[PDB]
Amino acid sequence: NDTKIASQLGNCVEYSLYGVSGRGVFQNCTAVGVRQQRFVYDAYQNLVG
Amino acid sequence: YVDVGPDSVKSACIEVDIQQTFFDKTWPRPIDVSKADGIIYPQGRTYSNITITYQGLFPYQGDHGDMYVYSAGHATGTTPQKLFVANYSQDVKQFANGFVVRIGAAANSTGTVIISPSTSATIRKIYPAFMLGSSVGNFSDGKMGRFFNHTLVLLPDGCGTLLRAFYCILEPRSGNHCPAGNSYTSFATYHTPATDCSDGNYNRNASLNSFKEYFNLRNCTFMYTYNITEDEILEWFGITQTAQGVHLFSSRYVDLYGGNMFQFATLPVYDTIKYYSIIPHSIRSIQSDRKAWAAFYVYKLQPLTFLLDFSVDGYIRRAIDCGFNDLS
Numbered sequence: 006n007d008t009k010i011a012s013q014l015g016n017c018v019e020y021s022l023y024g025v026s027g028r029g030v031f032q033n034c035t036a037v038g039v040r041q042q043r044f045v046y047d048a049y050q051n052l053v054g
Numbered sequence: 055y056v057d058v059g060p061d062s063v064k065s066a067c068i069e070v071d072i073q074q075t076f077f078d079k080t081w082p083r084p085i086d087v088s089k090a091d092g093i094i095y096p097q098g099r100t101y102s103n104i105t106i107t108y109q110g111l112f113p114y115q116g117d118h119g120d121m122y123v124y125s126a127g128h129a130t131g132t133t134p135q136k137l138f139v140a141n142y143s144q145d146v147k148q149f150a151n152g153f154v155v156r157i158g159a160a161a162n163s164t165g166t167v168i169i170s171p172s173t174s175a176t177i178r179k180i181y182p183a184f185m186l187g188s189s190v191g192n193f194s195d196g197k198m199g200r201f202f203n204h205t206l207v208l209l210p211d212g213c214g215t216l217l218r219a220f221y222c223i224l225e226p227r228s229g230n231h232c233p234a235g236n237s238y239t240s241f242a243t244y245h246t247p248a249t250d251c252s253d254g255n256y257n258r259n260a261s262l263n264s265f266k267e268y269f270n271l272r273n274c275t276f277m278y279t280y281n282i283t284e285d286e287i288l289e290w291f292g293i294t295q296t297a298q299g300v301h302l303f304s305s306r307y308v309d310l311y312g313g314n315m316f317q318f319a320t321l322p323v324y325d326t327i328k329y330y331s332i333i334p335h336s337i338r339s340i341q342s343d344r345k346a347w348a349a350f351y352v353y354k355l356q357p358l359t360f361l362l363d364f365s366v367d368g369y370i371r372r373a374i375d376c377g378f379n380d381l382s
Contacts, residue, residue: 038367039308042100053102 027052056222056274059259062266065229070242071128074141076169081349082118083159087378090370092154092290092353093362094303094315103366111294112360113154113353115375120352124180125169126337126344127244134246134338138169142334143240144198146190149327152355154292154303154315157181160348161286167346175346179286181210181217182350183243183261183333186293186300190329194226195238199331204275206300206323209243209333212260213251215282219302221323222274232268241268246338261335276322282306290315294355299324312369 012031019028025044034054037045045053085091092113113119122142128135158179165177187205192198207220226233233241243264245251250260290305290313300321308316332352337344363372374382 037100037102038365038369039095039100041308042098042368044098045100045102047102048104048106 025052056277058220058222058262058271058274058277061270062263064267065227065232065235067227067229067231067267068127068244069136069231069237070239071136071138072141072240073138073169076138076171077123077125077140079121079123079168079349081121081160083121083156083351084118085113085115085353087115087360087373087375090312090314090363090373092315093360093370093373094154094292095308095370097317100368101364102368103364105361105363107359108362109357109359111151111355112358112375114356114358115378117353119156122182122332122350122352123168124182124335124337124347124350125167126339126341129339129341129344132340134340137242137244137336139240139242139334139336141240142332143242145331146199147330149186149295149330150354151357152292152294153330154290154353154355155182156351157289157291158286158348159288159351161288163348165346165348167344170341170344173344173346175344177346177348179214180347180350181214183210183335184208184331185333186327186330188326188328193233193238195233195236197238197240200233201329204273204325206321206327207265207333209261209265210282211262212245212257214284215256216258217280217282218262219276219278219280219321220271220274221276221321223272225270225272227268227270240334242334242336243268244336244338247343248339278319278321280319285310287311288313292355295324295327297324300327309369312365312371314369 015031017030127137160177161179167173167175187201189202193200204223228234230237250257292303294301302319303315304318305313307318361374362370365371
């Protein structure tokens with residue numbers, strides 16, 4: 006009985022991922038390692054993907 | 055309490071002869087930090103091929119480590135004889151905010167038997183056993199390292215494909231060559247390849263039962279088990295402790311070739327560990343069928359900082375210990 010919000014692709018809708026949160030656009034890009042660490046980050050700790 | 059299974063029937067044990075002078079060998083192994091040796095991967099995050107600074111527990115870069123070698127017990131003819139082992143049971147260590155180890159480092163090469171080194175047998179990977187706890191003291195015969203209350207046990211069982219962890223207590227036995235007996239020398243455990251590790255039925259309790267022959271497990275509160283498969287390629291392993299409890303790390307689960315450690319498992323026990331030791335073990339195989347075992351190494355963690363050169367696949371490929379020298 007819901008809208009199935011597990012993903013959008015995409016614009017800029019706030020998100021929560023296992024208690025990590027922020028707002029942003031998601032897009033279906035390619036993979037980078039390490040796989041299954043879930044959260045990819047840059048040197049400034051911005052989530053990358 | 056945990057169903058460890060029945061108490062072994064005999065209070066008796068196989069005699070343990072200390073042959074420690076046979077085990078003095080010189081094979082130091084300094085950490086090659088530019089290969090990211092001994093690097094524990096950061097928790098819960100990953101990175102691109104960007105280089106970043108980092109702070110965390112690590113082995114000292116110049117440390118060549120502590121080396122230990124497991125060996126076969128005495129045997130003659132076609133049958134087993136009294137055990138021949140190193141005096142490693144007496145090697146009590148203060149816990150030092152965790153440690154890391156190398157397993158199989160000498161694999162796919164040859165060496166010597168060590169205990170009967172003239173045979174010059176080829177060497178192969180063997181999995182180590184350990185014990186951890188909050189206190190130590192004298193054995194009733196004055197031997198070093200008796201433990202108090204409950205201790206962690208990490209024991210491979212049978213072949214290297216089975217691993218078990220425990221968090222219960224141990225009780226001494228009054229049989230010949232056992233801890234409450236006065237014929238006791240030192241604690242050891244053993245495996246017997248003649249019946250243990252059958253090819254169609256590996257003996258899942260083999261090492262555990264030989265452990266039971268020296269100590270009666272009592273009041274056990276935890277047990278865990280894991281599945282492993284054989285691989286002569288080198289593996290890394292280690293243990294750390296935090297206010298969330300003890301954690302287990304290995305390179306095997308994720309990075310078989312690069313060797314970066316990952317947290318494969320965690321443990322419920324947060325009781326502070328103040329002491330650590332390696333459990334001695336021996337092989338009960340026939341003397342003509344005896345095989346040499348690969349060298350095993352241990353290193354201790356410190357609150358060091360490093361450059362980390364992540365790969366685009368996020369494996370750490372190179373690192374710099376800042377304090378090693380002025381160039382670093």
